[PDB]
């Protein structure tokens, strides 16, 4: 979609207006860069307590979690050591 | 003390033989370097669920938590965004 989605992102709060076509993979990469997070760690992007798959678009998230455009889509995130 | 303390460290498992005079501040710095953790984050070193003060020595920890030299001193650690 050619639509803009408003959302927030906090560590398991900054606000974002983004293209709804953007994916979890893109956000993780944005976080990776914003916070300077090394490859020594993994980033889970989550809606509530459940991580999201990397191919999910922000629409998919709104559709899956039946977000009613009441406020920004609340996303959370977290880092784990990788191996 | 001129004594060696055996311990483990895992994210909230690697093993360590260390001088008992070493501090939480030193461990945090070791972790910071080992995992390449940027100043964009803070590191809490913990015994169980409670963080430890940076001046604590590994003895202090053994004395405070009444470790009986049954196995290595189990330490945990965790990262939070700073600000």
Curated annotation (Swiss-Prot), chains A, B:
Designated name of the protein: Polycomb complex protein BMI-1
Signal sequence annotation: none
Record region (Interaction with PHC2): 14-34
Residues of the full protein shown: 127 to 231 of 326
Modified how: Monoubiquitinated. May be polyubiquitinated; which does not lead to proteasomal degradation.
Expression induction: Down-regulated by oxidative stress.
Note: The hPRC-H complex purification reported by PubMed:12167701 probably presents a mixture of different PRC1-like complexes.
UniProt-annotated stretches for the region Interaction with E4F1: 16-80
Subunit record text: Component of a PRC1-like complex. Identified in a PRC1-like HPRC-H complex with CBX2, CBX4, CBX8, PHC1, PHC2, PHC3 RING1 and RNF2. Interacts with RNF2/RING2. Interacts with RING1. Part of a complex that contains RNF2, UB2D3 and BMI1, where RNF2 and BMI1 form a tight heterodimer, and UB2D3 interacts only with RNF2. The complex composed of RNF2, UB2D3 and BMI1 binds nucleosomes, and has activity only with nucleosomal histone H2A. Interacts with CBX7 and CBX8. Interacts with SPOP. Part of a complex consisting of BMI1, CUL3 and SPOP. Interacts with E4F1. Interacts with PHC2.
Origin organism lineage: Eukaryota, Metazoa, Chordata, Craniata, Vertebrata
Coiled coil: none
Compartments (UniProt record): Nucleus; Cytoplasm
Function summary: Component of a Polycomb group (PcG) multiprotein PRC1-like complex, a complex class required to maintain the transcriptionally repressive state of many genes, including Hox genes, throughout development. PcG PRC1 complex acts via chromatin remodeling and modification of histones; it mediates monoubiquitination of histone H2A 'Lys-119', rendering chromatin heritably changed in its expressibility. The complex composed of RNF2, UB2D3 and BMI1 binds nucleosomes, and has activity only with nucleosomal histone H2A.
């Amino acid at each position: 979609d050619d639509e803009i989605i408003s959302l927030s992102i906090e560590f398991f709060k900054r606000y974002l207006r983004c293209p709804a076509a953007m994916t979890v993979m893109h956000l993780r990469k944005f976080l990776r860069s914003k916070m300077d997070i090394p490859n020594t760690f993994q980033i889970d992007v989550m809606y509530e307590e459940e991580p999201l798959k990397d191919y999910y678009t922000l629409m998919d998230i709104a559709y899956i979690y039946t977000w009613r455009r009441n406020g920004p889509l609340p996303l959370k995130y977290r880092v784990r050591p990788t191996c």
